[PDB]
Amino acid sequence: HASAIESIETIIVDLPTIRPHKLAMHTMQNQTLVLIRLRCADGIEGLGESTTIGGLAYGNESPDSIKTNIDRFVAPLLIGQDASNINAAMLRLEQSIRGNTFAKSGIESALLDAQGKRLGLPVSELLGGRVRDALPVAWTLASGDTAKDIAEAQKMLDLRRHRIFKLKIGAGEVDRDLAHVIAIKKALGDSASVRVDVNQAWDEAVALRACRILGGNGIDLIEQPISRNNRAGMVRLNASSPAPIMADESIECVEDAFNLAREGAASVFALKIAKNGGPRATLRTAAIAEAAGIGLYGGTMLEGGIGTLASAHAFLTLNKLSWDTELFGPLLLTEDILAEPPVYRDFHLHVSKAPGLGLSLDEERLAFFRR
Amino acid sequence: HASAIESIETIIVDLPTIRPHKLAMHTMQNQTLVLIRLRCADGIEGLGESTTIGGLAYGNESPDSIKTNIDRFVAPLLIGQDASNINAAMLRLEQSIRGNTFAKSGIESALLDAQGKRLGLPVSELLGGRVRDALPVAWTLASGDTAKDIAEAQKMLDLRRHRIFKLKIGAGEVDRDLAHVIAIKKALGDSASVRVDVNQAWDEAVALRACRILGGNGIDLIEQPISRNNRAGMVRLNASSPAPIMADESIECVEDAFNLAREGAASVFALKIAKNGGPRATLRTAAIAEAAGIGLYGGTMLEGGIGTLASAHAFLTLNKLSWDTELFGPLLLTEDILAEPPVYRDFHLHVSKAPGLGLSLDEERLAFFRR
Amino acid sequence: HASAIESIETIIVDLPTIRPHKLAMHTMQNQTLVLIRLRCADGIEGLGESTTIGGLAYGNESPDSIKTNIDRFVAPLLIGQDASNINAAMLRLEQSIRGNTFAKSGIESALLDAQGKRLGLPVSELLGGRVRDALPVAWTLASGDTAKDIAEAQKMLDLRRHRIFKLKIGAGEVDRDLAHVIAIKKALGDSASVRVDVNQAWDEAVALRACRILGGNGIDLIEQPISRNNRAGMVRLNASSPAPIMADESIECVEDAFNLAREGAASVFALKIAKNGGPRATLRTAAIAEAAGIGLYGGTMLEGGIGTLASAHAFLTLNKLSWDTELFGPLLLTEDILAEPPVYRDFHLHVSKAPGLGLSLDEERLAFFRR
Amino acid sequence: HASAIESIETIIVDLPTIRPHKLAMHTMQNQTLVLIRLRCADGIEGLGESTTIGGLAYGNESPDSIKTNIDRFVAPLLIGQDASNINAAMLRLEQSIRGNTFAKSGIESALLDAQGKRLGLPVSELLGGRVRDALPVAWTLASGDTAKDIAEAQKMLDLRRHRIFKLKIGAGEVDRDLAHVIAIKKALGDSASVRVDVNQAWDEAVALRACRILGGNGIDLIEQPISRNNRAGMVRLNASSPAPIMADESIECVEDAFNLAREGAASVFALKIAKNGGPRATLRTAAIAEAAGIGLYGGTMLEGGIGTLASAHAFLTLNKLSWDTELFGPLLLTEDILAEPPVYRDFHLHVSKAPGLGLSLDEERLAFFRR
Ligand SMILES: O=C(O)C[C@H]1C=CC(=O)O1
Ligand SMILES: O=C(O)C[C@H]1C=CC(=O)O1
Ligand SMILES: O=C(O)C[C@H]1C=CC(=O)O1
Ligand SMILES: O=C(O)C[C@H]1C=CC(=O)O1
Ligand SMILES: [Mg+2]
Ligand SMILES: [Mg+2]
Ligand SMILES: [Mg+2]
Ligand SMILES: [Mg+2]
């Protein structure tokens, strides 16, 4: 085919971050991305990104294993295939490859980028058409210090950078974590929306009490308070919690979205291209949530500009994202591999109408930071 | 915008059929279509079709009211809008217009046709990319006579036209309808798949027995045996019936698909663009079904070539249609408004790769049959 | 520590098989194992095995990615740790590594082997004590030809090798697969137990009928007929099926076992060390099943002698394995890396009381077949 | 066998306590233990303990009937059996003896002690390996006087003996018991965790109100508020109670643990070797709880040092005991039969790495207190 895939190169890139990022299960000291360079017979190159958090501390795919599986199994299946038929290409992978959603997400992102350049259309238009040009972007406070977090949030407000804050908790004693969250919301008052993410850290026995306290203290959303494995517990917590509960880790594929909606495990779903298998699969998960009356949140696995924009282009097509987005990955990185970073201003991420993902590689940064 | 919608004309067309088509609630003596001609500033015209069965005997929208609502409410909302952004256009309609899925389906079909011509791509590619070029097509036997039906099916087999037969029942006494179906399957044996559609005609009290008899006599699928209103009954029948049950009328929007899947009301879903609001909405319903492990069937409201191809292009992108399709509408019509009819041969409908819906109007037929 | 782990080497070994093995999603032409060589400060070496089927066609871990993740993440965490405290070592991995059960299984197997040699006890005794010395072993028929399968089963009976047969179906047309299974059971009659494994291939719409037919034709067990994602469907099938349903792919961790038991998704559970994270985790899954009144089956991912014996030693401690085992992996391989193969005779696998896994490496075979 | 069991002697020992211990159904004025002395052919003696509370006021086994059933049924089954294969020995008992979990617990404890001495390993290592050397120990306040309880708790805090307090209620008027608990928590404030145990005393009609009041007054956990027989009620209370509910009496075997988890009867499970049938069975119950996302608590039936250490060794292997333990039995006894008592300091019980249960009998105390 004139648009046959000729090569797929995966590159692991280690990039510095602006500060330690403390999650319940892991403390980030930097970030590692897997860049995908997909080249086609018509001379077009598509760029994609597969990124996770903390090696294997978050999910079963590491940047290392993502490269291994793409090089050994994905490339052989796609090289020679028509790059202009994305649905057929991704279904070809689906029939021979189980799981590996992070790898698939990066691959589809690259195909979409190339197809966008091929047709001279931004990805958002390839996916149906945008209904907005900007997306609201929350900011995560996870320094591990209450005083530092409050100061940081106040500055982001003054800079008109962020007005929605996500607090990482679950690593310490429940009451200390609760006091921490309450103190932050008290300091910010009505000037900002404060939410929390427990990253599955709590047992239902703890969550049933903690959610009541948070809801009674101005916390707007409680993300994945308990293990995705306590299916019945998540359903019960949705009933006892006065604050809405959002599912994140509970979604590891489109089918999980349906089952969670069927069971009533959460009233809001985080949408992550890495967890669903790319922008298109993520839109199917969004369709399921919408059909069930479940709110949407534009999630991230802390991707750099490529993965962030791939996510953004899909979100631009959604009717509504009631709970906004957390597409701040590029801002946590002190250095990224894009020639021009995404545009952030006035509490939003602004997406252009340039072809594909509307970005280009910074060859110097790639050369220095690639492993 | 360069692709602004300049006009939308709705035309009611009354066309002759090859023979009376007897459904449980109505007997068709002909067919009426609503043609949509959408013209854009860049000189491109998109064609769409909104068609139903028996006036108001099947659904709440008649060809007459579809024209009324499109002319009075849809056109005012779309004229002047960018035709190249289909998602924004359909969402604009969704925010101001409740229901009217048949009208919406015709409108989106026209927009897709125009966009396909605009980019020089068939609709199937606009929707992501085809994974097949042909679709298996079933045939409905509904003459009202057992001997006639058997003869007709045998001929369709000999002509290599159809090998899957759908039998319309529910208008007569249950046992007489059952004998009718059993006699047909007995005569055809393993040379064909025989299924039935009761069009909601039976009460659960009757269906619980009838489904057992049909399943025990070689009937492969039982379509909408009871009222969509007996929600609990459909769930119970899925358990007592040895033959799979398919939901059709139970789906009147994407959200219904989710609720039916949540409740376990059917193991197979019929996919109709008219019932969901167009090809794109139908793909969302398909995504929900797939995520729930529910089989897919390419349904029809007996549309002519335009509506049939709009449906076909969407179905070409589905990973699998386990229960095939019933896209035979153009074959039931003795006359259609296409210059070249869809290609049917060797038990399938063959879809080309021509731009848009790959069709053109027969001006002479349109002029003579338009109301 | 005196028993500190000094090194962990992972070796990918490609071995020939006796014949093509056709599963619903993949056709095996050979087999690849990941050998784990764990050496301790006290001069003891423990051997473990992490093996899967068809690259990524079966699960999300490939032999390639298993090596990548063990070398990059597991080794760093364990080197220097006390090898004699297996629970602490495996929990150390669990707190930093998500998923990767296949890798974990191989690691724990190696630790158990080393600990057995260290104490001069077979693994079965380290795990509590055996209650049997032999395990019944089924045989899978998957040549893709009915005549060939019947002949093969008859020979295994005559050789007193196997009397329980597992038939792989789901790749072809349902009725053809059903005829295939029925013909085999008809030919063998009461001389053997015939079961099937659909490897998630069927939709519930198909399974609800197929299970009835199989149960009515002498088929003793139906393994994973539908997708693990159709949670509600598996529960419904357990009620409509006259033949017991066994969960396999539905179990990807110990927690899944609990949820399946809670929901009533299957009446029998396959026990696979690779799917649970090693012999010890598998015994926890067995404990859950037993507590729920669910039958046990000793499963396999087609491991060679090392993985097969690691599985066997755990199964020797179970009170009862009502549905026997399928520990025939070493028999499907024309060549393995053990100096002395496991002992198979009179329909059983016979496990010795030698220290650890009671095996040693064949250096010549390892050298020739290692990648 | 070289390690054949040659004799099993059961000895009832009546020991003085430090003060009356008032439970909802009984007031303890002393404590009675059943010591098990199991001697093997290799000259090794294993010690075990089967102890309950208040004769038959708590459970169906009394110290008297435990001795009767062990002497008449257990001994005959085990004498002559290989003591080094604990799993086979306990399964041999399970196939011929129904219930009698207290007796079984003492027997397995003795076998583990002997096996530990045989291999020169502490029981915790026989069970897989410890992940901690110390266990947090709560203290029960049950003098029947509010002023006395507050003073006692304050002293235990000052002595760095205990900082978690369990209050026995249910014997008096609900409001008086509630005032009692609230006054104690008020006096201790944040310096201690206060929990209650109602020992099944309340009717659901009372519990639904009382749990709300306790949860709203700083009470951290509510143990078995109602009858284990009101299965549906326990499930309902888990939803209405703002404080987590723990199941104790509801667990009388491993299977009960599964059923309670399936039904959602409690969010925390008390782990008692006497109620499950020994350390090993208790670890299976813990595995079920963990798989269900249910918190763990190290429970006691007020055993002396032998039974307390048997429990402790098992708990040392658990990944996490979110709700700590109540292994204070030896502290309630003014006299025990151990030559050296367990080590309690700085809010914890410290377990050594000595072989077996790491203890020896005080021949003088045994001689004087044995019945
Ligand atoms: O929250 C997660 O699970 C992943 C990621 C999203 C933002 C962030 O701070 O971490
Ligand atoms: O069956 C329906 O409900 C509508 C239509 C589909 C084919 C047919 O014969 O009628
Ligand atoms: O059946 C599976 O899923 C895996 C494996 C077990 C035996 C066999 O033939 O394949
Ligand atoms: O609470 C029980 O049911 C039994 C025991 C545990 C400690 C205590 O004080 O009594
Ligand atoms: Mg999260
Ligand atoms: Mg119908
Ligand atoms: Mg299987
Ligand atoms: Mg209690």
Automatic annotation (TrEMBL), chains A, B, C, D:
Name of the molecule in the record: Muconate cycloisomerase
Top-rank taxon: Bacteria
EC number per UniProt: 5.5.1.1
Enzyme class, broadest EC rank: isomerase
Residues the entry annotates as binding Mg(2+): D197, E223, D248, E249
Alphabetized PANTHER family for the sequence: O-SUCCINYLBENZOATE SYNTHASE, O-SUCCINYLBENZOATE SYNTHASE-RELATED
Active site (catalytic residues): K168 (proton donor), K168 (proton acceptor), E326 (proton donor/acceptor), E326 (proton donor)
Keyword line: Aromatic hydrocarbons catabolism, Isomerase, Manganese, Metal-binding
Provenance organism: Pseudomonas fluorescens (strain ATCC BAA-477 / NRRL B-23932 / Pf-5)
Any matching Pfam family: MR_MLE_N
GO terms of molecular function: chloromuconate cycloisomerase activity; manganese ion binding; muconate cycloisomerase activity; racemase and epimerase activity
Associated pathway: Aromatic compound metabolism
